[PDB]
Design a protein around this ligand. Structure first.
Ligand SMILES: [Ca+2]
Ligand SMILES: [Mg+2]
Ligand SMILES: [Mg+2]
Length: 430
DNA sequence: ATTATGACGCT
DNA sequence: AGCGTCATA
C-alpha cells in the first residue's frame, strides 16, 4: 500500500557510444564513413579478430569475435581498420583517448560513473529538479525529445518507424502531469530532455553518436539503452515494467547473463524476468543467497538501489597478451622479453596517468596462464610497485612467477605460457 | 586461435 | 590475498 516503496526516487541514465571503436576509426578516415566496416586486431591468423562492427556491416551478419576472413564471406565489401600494434602487441591508446573525450563532455552535465571504455551512468536526479524549476509548470514539447522512444507506447485504440516513435511520444506527453514537481514520470521526461542535450553535445564536439537509456536505476537504464540503437534514446518508466518484463528473458538483465541467470532459470523453472514476482523474498534468498535473493525480489519489480558511483577514471591500468596454440612461450628468454614489452607499455600508461590524474599505483599484479588450463587465469600474484620503471617491473614479475616453471632445465619454460598480464592497482593520491 | 581489457564478489 | 564471475570494445 502507502508504505510500499516503488524505486522511483532517482533519475538515472546510461549513455553508450554506438559501435565505438568503429566510430573512432571513421572519424579519422572519412573513407570508412557510412560503410560496412569493422575494427580488427592482428591480421595473420584468419585475417584478424573482429572487435567492433558498424551497423551497416551488422546487416550482413558480421559480428564481434568473428574472424575477418569469415566476416568477408558474409560481407565481401567489408572495410577494415586495424588496431595499432606497439611492442609486439595490440595497443588500445587511441580508443582510451577518445573515451576520455566523451567522458569529459558528459561530466559537464552531471556526475558520472565510468562503466566501460564507452559507457557511463549518469545520476540526473538533481539536474532534473533544477530544470523543473526553470520550466515553471511549463509543459514539455515533443520538439525537445527528437530522438526519444517511450517504451511500451504507442498502445491502444502509420506504418513507418519515425511515425511510431512520435505516436508513442505524443501519447506519453498527452498523459503527463506537469504541475506535479514530484511526479516520477515527469522527472524521467525531463531527464530525457537533458540526455538529448548531452547527446547533442557529444556529437557536436566529438563527431561520435551514442544511444542512451533513461529510467529510475542503473539496471533499467542499461536495459532501456539497448532497446533502440543506434543514435536513439529510450525512456523506461516504472509503469512500463510489468509488460516489458513479462516477456524479457532473464539473461538480458545486467548480472544475470551468466551462471547465476542460468541457475535462476533452472532452479525456478521460469524463462522471463516478470515470472520472478511469484516468489517470496525468503524463497529467492534460499536459492540464490541473501544478497542476490533480495536483489532479485526487488529487481523483478523494477526496483534497484545501486548508486551511480562518482568515478570517471579506471581503478586499474593493465596490459595483457595471449600466446595461443603454437606461439606459447617455452623459453626463459621469451618469457622475459614479453614481460619487458608489457612492462614498457604499462610504464608509458602509468607515467601519463600520474601526470594527468595526480595519483600513483602501489601494487603490481602478475598473472599467467599455462598451456592446458581451461581457466582464463592460472596464477595471480601481487608484489610491491614502488617505481614506474619497466625493467624493474618486469624483473619483479619474473621473480614472482619464475617458480611456476616445471622444467628441470633453467633455460626452458614448461608448461609453456599462453598468457601474460601485468596490472597496476591500489592508487594513492600524489 | 577472439583478445585486451576492467569492476566487483567470495572466503 | 588469490580466485571466480560478469561484463565491454
Ligand atoms: Ca557501445
Ligand atoms: Mg558499451
Ligand atoms: Mg557491444
Amino acid at each position: 500500500g502507502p508504505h510500499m516503496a516503488t524505486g522511483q526516487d532517482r533519475v538515472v541514465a546510461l549513455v553508450d557510444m554506438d559501435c565505438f571503436f568503429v566510430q573512432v576509426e571513421q572519424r579519422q578516415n572519412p573513407h570508412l564513413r557510412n560503410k560496412p566496416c569493422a575494427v580488427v586486431q592482428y591480421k595473420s591468423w584468419k585475417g584478424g579478430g573482429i572487435i567492433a562492427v558498424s551497423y551497416e556491416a551488422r546487416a550482413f551478419g558480421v559480428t564481434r569475435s568473428m574472424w575477418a576472413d569469415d566476416a568477408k564471406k558474409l560481407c565481401p565489401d567489408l572495410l577494415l581498420a586495424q588496431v595499432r600494434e606497439s611492442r609486439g602487441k595490440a595497443n588500445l591508446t587511441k580508443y582510451r583517448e577518445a573515451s576520455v573525450e566523451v567522458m569529459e563532455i558528459m561530466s559537464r552535465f552531471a556526475v558520472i560513473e565510468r562503466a566501460s571504455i564507452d559507457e557511463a551512468y549518469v545520476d540526473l536526479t538533481s539536474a532534473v529538479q533544477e530544470r523543473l524549476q526553470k520550466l515553471q509548470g511549463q509543459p514539455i514539447s515533443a520538439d525537445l525529445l527528437p530522438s526519444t522512444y517511450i517504451e511500451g507506447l504507442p498502445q491502444g485504440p502509420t506504418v513507418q518507424k519515425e511515425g511510431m516513435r512520435k505516436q508513442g511520444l505524443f501519447q506519453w506527453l498527452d498523459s503527463l502531469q506537469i504541475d506535479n514537481l514530484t511526479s516520477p514520470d515527469l522527472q524521467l521526461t525531463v531527464g530525457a530532455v537533458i540526455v538529448e542535450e548531452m547527446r547533442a553535445a557529444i556529437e557536436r564536439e566529438t563527431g561520435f553518436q551514442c544511444s542512451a537509456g533513461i529510467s529510475h536505476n542503473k539496471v533499467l537504464a542499461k536495459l532501456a539503452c539497448g532497446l533502440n540503437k543506434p543514435n536513439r534514446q529510450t525512456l523506461v518508466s516504472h509503469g512500463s515494467v510489468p509488460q516489458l518484463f513479462s516477456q524479457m528473458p532473464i539473461r538480458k538483465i545486467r548480472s544475470l547473463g551468466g551462471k547465476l541467470g542460468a541457475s535462476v532459470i533452472e532452479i525456478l523453472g521460469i524463462e522471463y524476468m516478470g515470472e520472478l514476482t511469484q516468489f517470496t523474498e525468503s524463497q529467492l534468498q534460499s536459492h540464490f543467497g541473501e544478497k542476490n535473493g533480495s536483489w532479485l525480489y526487488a529487481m523483478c519489480r523494477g526496483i534497484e538501489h545501486d548508486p551511480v558511483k562518482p568515478r570517471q577514471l579506471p581503478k586499474t591500468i593493465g596490459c595483457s597478451k595471449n600466446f595461443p596454440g603454437k606461439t606459447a612461450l617455452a623459453t626463459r628468454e621469451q618469457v622475459q622479453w614479453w614481460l619487458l614489452q608489457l612492462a614498457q607499455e604499462l610504464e608509458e600508461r602509468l607515467t601519463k596517468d600520474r601526470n594527468d590524474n595526480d595519483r600513483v599505483a602501489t601494487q603490481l599484479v602478475v598473472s599467467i596462464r599455462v598451456q592446458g588450463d581451461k581457466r582464463l587465469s592460472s596464477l595471480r600474484r601481487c608484489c610491491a610497485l614502488t617505481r614506474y620503471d619497466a625493467h624493474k617491473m618486469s624483473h619483479d614479475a619474473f621473480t614472482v612467477i619464475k617458480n611456476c616453471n616445471t622444467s628441470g632445465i633453467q633455460t626452458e619454460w614448461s608448461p609453456p605460457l599462453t598468457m601474460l598480464f601485468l596490472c597496476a592497482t591500489k592508487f594513492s593520491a600524489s
